[PDB]
Amino acid sequence: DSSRRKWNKTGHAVRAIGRLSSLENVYIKADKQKNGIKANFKFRHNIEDGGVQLAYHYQQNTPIGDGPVLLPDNHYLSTQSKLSKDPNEKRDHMVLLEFVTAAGITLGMVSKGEELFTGVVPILVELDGDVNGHKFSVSGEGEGDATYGKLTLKFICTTGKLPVPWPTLVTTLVLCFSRYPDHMKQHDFFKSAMPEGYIQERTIFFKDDGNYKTRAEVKFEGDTLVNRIELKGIDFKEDGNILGHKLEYNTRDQLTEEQIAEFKEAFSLFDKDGDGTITTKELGTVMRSLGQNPTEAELQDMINEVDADGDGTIDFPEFLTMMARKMKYTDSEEEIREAFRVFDKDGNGYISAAELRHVMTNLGEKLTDEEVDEMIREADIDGDGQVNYEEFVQMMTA
Ligand SMILES: [Ca+2]
Ligand SMILES: [Ca+2]
Ligand SMILES: [Ca+2]
Ligand SMILES: [Ca+2]
Ligand SMILES: [Ca+2]
Ligand SMILES: [Ca+2]
Ligand SMILES: [Ca+2]
Ligand SMILES: [Ca+2]
């Protein structure tokens, strides 16, 4: 009904502000001392029975050769991964489709190495791992098309059963296939190092669990881009999310026309002039009405995090993409409590009629005592005439 609808709209607006206030990309910076780069990012692994397992990545890349390389200005990669199974494959395996694009530098050149990536390039991946003494090997093959930032790879566990979930190896298992836009070609360290290649090293901290340490060599061997990796994992819990295999494999890419309609309702709460784009002025208006008070610089940074075309506004399509990702990957307890606190103004753990009234009428919706109570009632599982945390979580989940 049109009170379930008022939750969705208001809920989606609050989750849009949570996304814009988070750091979900691959952040790249120059490392002049090593003639390379550093990167850091957070990867979200959905836990099968509900919840999210966070993996915090720190990364270093250094050229294998002494040729000149491109040291970038600060930017990010935005990524999109889809995992599948080959229905005719009997071995323990993963099929990976990946798109990666560079952005984060607003609107206002090309290495010799970039010429090696103008068409489709065959890829080979080899990994040797040891997690808590559980050894394994992975072999992969496929191709990369950097013109579109596109990877297709199939991986086999050559040692039998993979002792960790496949999703935990995705980031370890060729950022030289990223699409850099024309205005960012001078910031592409990865292709610039080719064909001699680069060393990629990481430490990956699985929160409340162990860590991976990785070292990889990425270079051309003949016409093939090869990724050779060693992985060491330590201090994992015997029945944690990783060694207990509790992580989801296939995350939902299935996004209904009903869900898109819900996102467009939320969009139009921000896009108050109906021109199909959200400006810093429009984002700030909504945040102030929810009781936050961002500076111009914060608003610019929030938009920059999802601003695919670098024009300084969140276009409708950029808004749909950001919302699709936000529904695909589970929020942490901390992010859900932060959304809850937008409503629970007094912090007593209960969203009251007065509290939800105060939110709704500050967001500019004219709702009288009646439909407020209709909204409370829609979410009120236990009859107390208020919305508690668990009731909030249920309202917010698709
Ligand atoms: Ca992720
Ligand atoms: Ca990090
Ligand atoms: Ca994924
Ligand atoms: Ca290219
Ligand atoms: Ca607008
Ligand atoms: Ca834009
Ligand atoms: Ca309260
Ligand atoms: Ca209740």
Author numbering: 38 to 145, 158 to 222, 226 to 450
Publication passage describing the model:
Here we constructed the prototype of a photo-switchable Ca2+ sensor based on GCaMP5G that can be switched with 405/488-nm light and describe its molecular mechanisms at the structural level, including the importance of the interaction of the core barrel structure of the fluorescent protein with the Ca2+ receptor moiety. We engineered a prototype rsGEI based on the conventional Ca2+ indicator GCaMP5G28 by coupling cis/trans photo-isomerization, which underlies the photo-switching, to Ca2+ binding. In the present work we introduce the concept of rsGEIs. These sensors show photo-switching only when bound to the molecule of interest.
The variant rsGCaMP1.1 shows a poor fluorescent quantum yield (QY) of only 1.6%. Hence, we further introduced mutations in the region of the chromophore, resulting in variants with a molecular brightness of ~1/4 that of the well-used RSFP rsEGFP2 and of ~1/7 of GCaMP5G. We further mutated rsGCaMPs to increase brightness. The reason for the almost sixfold increase in brightness of rsGCaMP1.2 and rsGCaMP1.3 compared to rsGCaMP is apparent from their crystal structures, which show a I71H-enhanced water network and a direct effect of V107T in stabilization of the ON-state chromophore. Overall this suggests that rsGCaMPs may be engineered using similar strategies as for RSFPs.
